[PDB]
């Protein structure tokens, strides 16, 4: 049940195209299992997109893709490629490739999966987060990490020394098209006044760095 290897995360504007590649074999009998492509949007159901026969390039695309999708393989027939054209916002999802096991005759039983390729379709431009304090009143405190694009941000406290009782929530997508999240932690109410609390925020996509002290 080896993992399939997919290309990295992508950001596209509406109208543009994206290609997701999936290496399913090595370049070194029996019939080859088709390669399947599926996607899963944030907090949505898994959705089948297509299969592709690596032997002859035969394909089958879900009727609801309206011919916007194309699946191909390379000459050595070891890497599959899924191109999605005319992207729209609701194409935003993690895209997977998948395949049945060679030893089996269960063509839909996906023993092999890629790690997933996040694809984000938005009109929004890259932007670092603003970081605001969530001042304390055990007492709770935290940082509001607001108005960034695209995902992800990373958050630590006191440069990693503080890990106990930290909750860093999943990001939500705001109506402005920018993401926002919060990171909270609970501490003794005596800590305040002597113990310094600082959330450290990184946003690789913008090479942005923020360190915010949180105090009452």
């Amino acid at each position: 049940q080896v993992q399939l290897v997919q290309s990295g995360a992508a950001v596209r504007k509406p109208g543009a195209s994206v290609t997701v590649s999936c290496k399913f074999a090595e370049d070194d009998p029996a019939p080859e299992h088709f390669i399947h492509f599926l996607r899963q949007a944030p907090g949505q159901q898994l959705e089948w997109l297509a299969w592709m026969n690596p032997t002859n390039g035969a394909v089958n695309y879900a009727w609801y893709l309206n011919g916007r999708v194309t699946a191909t393989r390379d000459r050595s027939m070891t890497t599959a490629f899924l191109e999605v054209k005319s992207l729209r916002s609701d194409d935003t999802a993690v895209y997977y490739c998948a395949r049945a096991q060679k030893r089996g005759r269960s063509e839909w039983a996906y023993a092999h999966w890629g790690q997933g390729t996040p694809v984000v379709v938005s009109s929004a431009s890259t932007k670092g987060p603003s970081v605001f304090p969530l001042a304390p009143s055990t007492a709770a405190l935290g940082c509001l990490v607001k108005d960034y694009f695209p995902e992800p941000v990373t958050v630590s406290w006191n440069s990693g020394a503080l890990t106990s009782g930290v909750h860093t929530f999943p990001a939500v997508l705001q109506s402005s098209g920018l993401y926002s999240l919060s990171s909270v932690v609970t501490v003794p109410s005596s800590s305040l006044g002597t113990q310094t609390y600082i959330c450290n925020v990184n946003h690789k996509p913008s090479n942005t760095k923020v360190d915010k002290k949180v105090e009452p």
Binding site: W48, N56, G57, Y61, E107
Partner: protein, 347 residues
Amino acid sequence: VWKDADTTLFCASDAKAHETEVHNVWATHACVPTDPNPQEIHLENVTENFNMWKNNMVEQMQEDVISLWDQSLQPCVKLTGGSVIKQACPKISFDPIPIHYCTPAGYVILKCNDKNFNGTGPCKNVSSVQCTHGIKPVVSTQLLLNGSLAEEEIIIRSENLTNNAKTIIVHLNKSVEINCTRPSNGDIRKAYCEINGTKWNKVLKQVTEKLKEHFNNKTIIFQPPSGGDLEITMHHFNCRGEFFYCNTTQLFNNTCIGNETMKGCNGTITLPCKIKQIINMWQGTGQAMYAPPIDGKINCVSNITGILLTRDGGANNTSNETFRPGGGNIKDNWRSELYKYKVVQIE
């Protein structure tokens, strides 16, 4: 008493020993002569299960056809992996002949005779034979050529009709001629196939109605292939040794299938074809290059006796089903002729 079993079959044929035609040559050394007076025995009150989709006779025919092509249709250049083989590539004489498949001693072939048997499940009218009928090893895509016809109604075969990853074989009960020509004397590679439009659209209409029975009276739509190599996006076959590729867009033309009295639905349908020198081998072994076509009129008149289809996937399709020409692999061509046979061991 007996039981389903796999064994090494042998072939029989009426090949001409003096002939240079390549099927004749292969069969003269690989097969025995036909049995003049073959024996067939109805097995009264016997019911038997068949499965055309898991039938080892098909694998054996495949090996034979691959072997025939390997020794008869040598390309000038063969490109496999990193190996480049440059050999000699003389023009040949090529015209498939019927091959019968026969069981050895201790074994026998059971044959399903139910008029509308669909390839899977019980047969009520069963007989035993020593050999199959004569099957031409015609290699083609999309359209099945020069095959045998369903006895009564048009028949839809599939391991699972609801499974979009499974090939559908339509078995016609009346053949439609396709007349493919590369004229002499303007590109030498340019060719075309003519088909009687009146005749073809009548048949295709019957096919849609047949599919309606299997898909809950839903709207049935035909479309061109969605993609793939040219061997499968086009009707691909070998005529007189030359490799033809024909565009079938016009054969699957919903306009004329709505029964709508419409202009041009009658009359001759002319498909554009090309003869290619550089091809992908159906045997699965990469690219091969051949020499340019022979001079003069190259003509093949074939019977369309069947159609391979793939059905569009996607859940909640609700209102319709869409079918595109082409499906599966060349083994399925043999399955369409071997569907009614299976081998058993006499115990």
